[PDB]
Amino acid sequence: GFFSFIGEAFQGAGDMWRAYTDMKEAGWKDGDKYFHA
Amino acid sequence: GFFSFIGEAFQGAGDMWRAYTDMKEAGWKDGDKYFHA
Amino acid sequence: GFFSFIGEAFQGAGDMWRAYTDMKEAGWKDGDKYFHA
Amino acid sequence: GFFSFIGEAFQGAGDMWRAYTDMKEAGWKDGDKYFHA
Amino acid sequence: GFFSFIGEAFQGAGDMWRAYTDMKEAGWKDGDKYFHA
Amino acid sequence: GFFSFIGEAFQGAGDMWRAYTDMKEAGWKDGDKYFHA
Amino acid sequence: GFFSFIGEAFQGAGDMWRAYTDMKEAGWKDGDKYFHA
Amino acid sequence: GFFSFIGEAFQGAGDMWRAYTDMKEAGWKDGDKYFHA
Amino acid sequence: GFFSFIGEAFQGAGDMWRAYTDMKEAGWKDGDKYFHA
Amino acid sequence: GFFSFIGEAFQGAGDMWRAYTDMKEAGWKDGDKYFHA
Amino acid sequence: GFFSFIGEAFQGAGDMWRAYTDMKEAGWKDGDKYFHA
Amino acid sequence: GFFSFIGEAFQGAGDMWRAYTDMKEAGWKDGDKYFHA
């Protein structure tokens, strides 16, 4: 894949550029994400 | 794939540029996402 | 695929540029998303 | 595919540019999405 | 496919530019979407 | 296909630019959509 | 697309089931094909 | 796409089931193909 | 894509099930193919 | 992609199940292929 | 990608299941392939 | 990727299950391959 980003990126809560690869018989659990202003 | 982004990107809560690949017999669970202003 | 974006992108709660690929015997669960203003 | 976007994009709750590809014997579940103003 | 968009796009709750491709023996479930103003 | 859009697009609840392609033995379910003003 | 072939297919010289997809700013050149009997 | 082939396929010289995908600023050159009997 | 082949496939000289994907600023050159009987 | 092959496959000279992926500023050269009987 | 092969595969000279991936500023050269019977 | 092979595979001269990955500023050269019977 190809991606070109120019400028600003904002994230309050969470993940950025996560790459999970080549898994077998795996499990996981992600929590909740909250944003308050 | 090809993507070109110029400018600003805003996310309050969640994931950006997530890439899950090559999985077998996998499982997972993502939580809830909240935004308040 | 090809995509060209120029300007601003806003997301209160959720995912952006998610790419799930090459899965076998997989499962998952995404939560709810809330926006309040 | 080809897409050209110029200007602003707004999303209160949900996903943007989701790409699910090459799946076999897969399952998942997405939650509800709420918008309040 | 080819698409050219110039201007503003607004979504209260839901998905934008979703691309599901190359699936076999798959299943999923999307939730409800609410808009209040 | 070819599409040219100039101006504004508004959606209260639902999907925009959804592209489902190359499916075999698939199933899914979409929820209800509500708009209140 | 959908195709169902039952029987024999013969080709002396050339390509079969060629699929070129999603190209931008591309070029190529194919040669000549000869058949003698 | 969908294809179902039952029987025999013969090729003297060339390619079968070629799939070129997602290219940008690419170039190539294929040679000649000869068949003699 | 989907393909189902049942039976025999013969190739004297060349490629089978070639898959070139996700290229940028690439070049190559293929040679000639000869068949004699 | 999906492919199902049942039976025999014969190749005198060349490649089978070649997969080139994710290349940038690349070059190469393939030779000639000969078949004699 | 997904592939299912049942039966026999014969190659006189060349490569099988070649996978080149994630290259930048690369070059190479493959030789000729001969088959005699 | 996913591959399932059941049966026999024959190669006279060449490579099988070659996997080249994550290269930068690389070069190489492969020789010729001959088959005689």
Author numbering:
A (entry chain A), B (entry chain C), C (entry chain E), D (entry chain G), E (entry chain I), F (entry chain K), ...: 1 to 37
Question: Could you share sentences copied from the article?
Answer:
SAA1.1 is an acute phase protein that becomes strongly upregulated during inflammation. Chronic inflammatory conditions, such as tuberculosis, leprosy and rheumatoid arthritis, are risk factors for the development of systemic AA amyloidosis. We report three cryo-EM structures of SAA1.1-derived amyloid fibrils: one that was extracted from the diseased murine tissue and two that were formed from murine SAA1.1 protein in vitro. In vitro and ex vivo fibrils possess parallel cross-β sheets but differ in their overall topologies and fibril protein folds.
In vitro formed fibrils are also polymorphic and contain one major fibril morphology (morphology i). This fibril corresponds to 75% of the fibrils present in solution and is considerably thinner than the other analyzed fibril morphology, termed here morphology ii. Cryo-EM reconstructions achieved spatial resolutions of 2.73 Å for morphology i and 2.95 Å for morphology ii. Morphology i is polar and presents a pseudo 21-screw symmetry. A single PF consists of two structurally equal stacks of fibril proteins that are arranged such that residues Gly1 and Phe2 from one stack interact with residues Asp22-Lys24 in the other stack. The Gly1 α-amino group is in the vicinity of the Asp22 side chain, while Phe2 inserts into a small pocket formed by Asp22-Lys24 main chain and side chain atoms. The PF encloses a large internal cavity that appears water filled as it is lined with polar (Thr21) and charged (Gly1, Asp22) amino acid residues. The ordered core of the in vitro fibrils is considerably smaller and formed by residues 1-37. The in vitro fibril contains seven β-strands (β1 to β7) at residues Phe2-Ile6, Glu8-Gln11, Asp15-Met16, Arg18-Thr21, Met23-Lys24, Ala26-Asp30, and Asp32-His36. Residues 1–37 form two partially overlapping arches (Gly1-Thr21 and Gly12-His36), reminiscent of the ex vivo fibril.
